[PDB]
Design goal:
The structure is cut from a larger assembly and holds chains A (about 170 residues) and B (about 120 residues).
Chain A (H helix, E strand, L loop, with lengths): L27 H29 L24 H36 L3 H4 L1 H18 L8 H23 L1
Helix pairs in contact in A: 2-4
Chain B lengths: L29 H20 L9 H39 L24
Helix pairs in contact in B: 1-2
The chains are: A mainly alpha (about 170), B mainly alpha (about 120).
Bound molecules: cardiolipin, the ligand CCCCCCCCCCCCCCCCC[C@@H](O)O[C@H](CO[C@H](O)CCCCCCCCCCCCCCC)COP(=O)(O)OCC[N+](C)(C)C and 1,2-Distearoyl-sn-glycerophosphoethanolamine (3PE).
1,2-Distearoyl-sn-glycerophosphoethanolamine binds next to helix 1 and helix 2 of chain B.
PDB class: membrane protein
Keywords: metformin, electron transport chain, Respirasome, membrane protein
Entry title: Complex I from respirasome closed state 1 bound by metformin and CoQ10 (SC-MetC1-iv)
Chain lengths: ~170, ~120
């Protein structure tokens, strides 16, 4: 279906075995499926055809809002309230986008577990590693900021992390 | 006393001549409307104490209450605005004339400022 992006939400190709009956007994599942298609699928398909015909006569569109990038809290001067406001709003939007990225990866993980079923521990190792990396980065970004989090606090955390990394590299080189 | 004894101050002058250069309060000022509301409340309380019908009796008396309150409120607001403008004038003059006491400071960005991070956990 073109409703969602197959690249963002991958699905492995579906391999369905062909029926290979070994008995002369009729298949109750097949008979009930035929009854279901005759009694439910055709009426709902006709109803949806009518509804979509009604929708096609009044076609109209909605758009995805685009935000241009603005200077961030690193570029903002001290107590420059307008720049701080713009940077904080941009940081909040980016935080929301990152949360939704983590949600997408988790949906991938859940879908792959359910799909692979009894062989999930081996066949879902690729989606587990992506989730591990994404969650590690997201945690390092916004792990323990607090209820009153802000771009200034996140920048202070990043500065602390950078100082720790620099000290570790210097100690290793020593 | 901060502004008592200010140079050029004429004693017992509610509004000096230099106050004429400031914008007078509008007649629809919310503060003036609140003063009129105070006058109306005073009229209602007067009717209540004198045991007249609170809302209906003494329309002339209530109108005089409101008018007197609005009049004194307009002049009071003029004086308040003049005094605050005078305070700002003196503050700006002192800041300008004492640059060594009020120096400009180099503005550093938060990319240069180092702030300690306190995790919430
Ligand atoms: C309206 C909202 C106001 C909000 C607060 C604003 C500030 C205060 C208002 C100014 C003063 C108002 C008058 C006070 C005396 C009232 C006496 C009385 O009976 O009044 C009844 C009177 C009608 O009765 P009446 O036939 O004349 O006489 C019957 C006797 O008085 C019958 O008398 P009685 O013999 O039966 O007397 C017995 C009674 C006597 O009791 C009283 O008289 C109560 C009122 C006096 C107490 C103090 C009032 C507040 C004074 C200022 C203090 C601060 C106020 C704010 C406090 C905030 C925090 C609480 O005592 C008791 O019942 C004792 C038990 C209760 C005691 C404990 C509770 C005390 C509460 C104290 C605080 C009350 C705050 C609100 C007061 C509202 C009053 C209307 O109605 C009014 O006075 C209504 C108010 C005026 C309305 C004008 C409407 C104009 C037209 C529409 C305009 C629309 C808006 C305009 C814009 C354009 C739109 C298109
Ligand atoms: C030339 C012909 C025209 C002349 C025009 C007349 C010039 C003015 C004449 C003034 C009246 C004649 C003298 C009568 C007594 C004067 C009283 C008043 O005018 O004086 C002023 C005084 O004005 C009053 O103080 C302001 C009254 C404000 C009333 C409200 C107070 C604020 C309360 C806060 C809550 C408000 C609630 C709402 C209230 C309704 C300043 O005089 P000043 O010599 O310098 O006082 C010395 C003492 N100080 C320095 C400590 C102050
Ligand atoms: C009668 C009973 C007694 C109560 C009388 C209440 C009204 C008194 C004032 C009457 C009108 C006076 C007047 O001319 O007011 C106009 C003035 C604003 O005029 P101006 O700003 O020049 O015009 C707009 C320009 N942009 O307006 C002002 O400056 C506003 C000052 C008055 C503020 C009044 C606040 C409320 C007072 C109580 C109202 C009660 C209403 C209900 C009464 C019911 C009586 C049964």
């Amino acid at each position: 279906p073109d409703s969602w992006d197959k690249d963002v939400y991958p699905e492995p190709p579906r391999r369905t075995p062909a029926p290979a009956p070994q008995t002369s007994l009729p298949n109750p599942v097949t008979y009930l499926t035929k009854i279901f298609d005759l009694l439910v699928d055709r009426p709902v398909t006709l109803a949806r055809e009518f509804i979509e015909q009604q929708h096609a006569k009044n076609r109209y569109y909605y758009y995805h809002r685009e935000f241009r990038r603005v200077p961030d809290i690193t570029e903002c001067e001290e107590k420059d309230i307008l720049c701080m406001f713009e940077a904080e709003m941009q940081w909040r939007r980016d935080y929301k986008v990152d949360q939704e990225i983590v949600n997408i990866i988790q949906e991938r993980l859940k879908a792959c577990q359910q799909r692979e079923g009894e062989s999930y521990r081996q066949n879902c190792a690729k989606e587990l590693e992506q989730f591990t990396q994404v969650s590690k980065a997201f945690q390092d970004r916004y792990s323990d900021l607090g209820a009153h989090y802000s771009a200034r606090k996140c920048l202070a955390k990043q500065k602390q992390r950078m100082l720790a990394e620099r000290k570790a590299a210097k100690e290793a080189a020593a | 006393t901060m502004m008592s004894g200010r140079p050029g101050r004429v004693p017992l002058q509610f509004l000096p001549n230099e106050a004429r250069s400031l914008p007078p309060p509008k007649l629809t000022d919310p503060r003036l409307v609140y003063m009129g509301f105070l006058g109306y409340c005073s009229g209602l309380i007067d009717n209540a104490i004198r045991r007249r019908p609170v809302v209906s009796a003494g329309l002339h008396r209530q109108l005089l209450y409101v008018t007197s309150f609005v009049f004194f409120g307009y002049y009071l607001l003029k004086r308040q605005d003049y005094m605050y403008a005078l305070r700002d004038h003196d503050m700006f003059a002192y800041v300008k004339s004492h640059p060594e006491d009020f120096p400009e400071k180099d503005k550093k960005t938060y990319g240069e400022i180092l702030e300690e991070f306190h995790p919430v956990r």
